Nucleic acid binder design. Sequence first.
RNA 1: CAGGCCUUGACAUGCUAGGGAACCCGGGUGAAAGCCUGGGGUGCCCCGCGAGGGGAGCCCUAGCACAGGUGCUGCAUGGC
RNA 2: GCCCGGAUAGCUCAGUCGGUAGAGCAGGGGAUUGAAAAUCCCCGUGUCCUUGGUUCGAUUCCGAGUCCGGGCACCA
Lengths: 140, 351
Amino acid sequence: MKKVVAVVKLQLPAGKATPAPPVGPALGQHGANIMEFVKAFNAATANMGDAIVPVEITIYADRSFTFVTKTPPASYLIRKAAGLEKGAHKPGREKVGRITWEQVLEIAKQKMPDLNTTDLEAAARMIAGSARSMGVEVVG
Amino acid sequence: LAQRLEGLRGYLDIPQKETRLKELERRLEDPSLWNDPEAARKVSQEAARLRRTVDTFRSLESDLQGLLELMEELPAEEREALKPELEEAAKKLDELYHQTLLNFPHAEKNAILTIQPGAGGTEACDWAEMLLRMYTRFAERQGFQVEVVDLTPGPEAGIDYAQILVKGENAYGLLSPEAGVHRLVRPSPFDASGRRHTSFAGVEVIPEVDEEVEVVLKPEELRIDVMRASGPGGQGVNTTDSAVRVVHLPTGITVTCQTTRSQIKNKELALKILKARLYELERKKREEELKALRGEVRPIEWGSQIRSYVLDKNYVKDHRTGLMRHDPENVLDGDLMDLIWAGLEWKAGRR
RNA sequence: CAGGCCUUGACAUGCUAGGGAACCCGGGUGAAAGCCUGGGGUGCCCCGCGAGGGGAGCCCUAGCACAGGUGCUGCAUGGC
RNA sequence: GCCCGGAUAGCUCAGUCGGUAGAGCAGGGGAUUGAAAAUCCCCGUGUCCUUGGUUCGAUUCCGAGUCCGGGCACCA
């Protein structure tokens, strides 16, 4: 999130990204290019590792942009702690995963910036609501 | 050796569809196309079909280079530790097969096989009697379930008509290619000299789609009229609007009744007639939409064969693909997977 | 048929290379097959007592031409 | 729509005062013939339409419904 009247925030793949499948053309519809965010972009994706990369865009109408990289979405960073890939067709009380108490503080060293709280406990009770969205148990 | 042909059966579809995905992925990146609610959706399904054409060409160039370089047939340490790495990556090679089998408009449901004899008379029915148990073991080996809907003998020897219903998941797609006229050439047992003779027999295949029987004509599209009765009677035939005319508006058919002297018994008697004449002209279309929906290969004549079985010189000739198998007495047991594999490539390869 | 293995292959001839050239006797893992591994030591043509190797039976590893088929065709055939 | 009659083996038909279910054809096994048909031996074969009642108990006797075959639907 930035400013408005011409911006788009997506969560790119990892490794390759140039075509149109993910969101490739959606940003061209609202103004974009092919030579600015493909190779002269994957400098960060080659470093961030893999999975998903919540990097966004900001249009100016002249190939300029505020390519503010972000931290992997709390939907994926949780598949790392438990293991499952999806989460659950429908959350609730049954789920194919498990996440102990300090299991949610393992990601506290990942998500720390713009969350809102600098500390670890005033920002973990936020992801505990995300542990009732995909489903992932809280071993207690 | 059973891996150089299947890895290439998706290699001819690469440039045919690869150069086509570009003149389609280059229309979405321009918003000027989105002004069409449906023409921008029609372009996004074929663009979404870049999911079976941009995933396979990714997990198919690693199964041809990561296996054909350090594969010694001499028991080693890097060879039997490399077989379980491709044993579920060759058990997965069926994912590229079912994509040319599950694409029929109705290959899921159970199928219906009609094995009818043809040219060759007395012998030709023995042929259909042999092809019947040939398809019987086949659908009993794969695991499917049989229902003999009809079987009927006849005069000398063979079989007159055989109609069977075979179930199981994706059954029609498996017995759809075996739809034609199968020729046989062998020494005639019903002859004194034993001369070499030829026999023809037809095999039809049709899935089990619709089943119910209901035509509730709600009086929503009916235009009933009440004209004054005609003929005998008295003051009452002149003055009472006895005669009635039920008019079927979405069709054009009009039935009339004047048998009785009442209107409520004549419009009801005119519906016991309109329902009848409909029950024949609404089923005549389920017989005319199904007499051109089967196909065309059924002359049974000399020159319309899909596969030839000859036990004289001992071989099987698939006239569609061109193959010549040498085990005829073995194909007559149910081993059909392979010629069905090929008939589902030759058939759905021209469309 | 299911399973474990062997591929110059169980056998016939012949070629090429250093092994190796009669040869007999253990151990190990495996159900067995097979793969691994431990020893005595090879008369002989014979310059030559000899260092050596020419050496014929001839066994072992590698390579080539080949071997193998109870797979089909008894209306392709012999013979019975 | 009223009045009368029926459904019983796969097919066509009989039958009991209520307690016994039968005939012909089909079908299965064997036999003959080189092999078919014909012929000969050996068998099996049913909620007696469904739904209730009386009775000690109903294929049968009454009630209801569904289907079928008929006769009736006139005077103006």
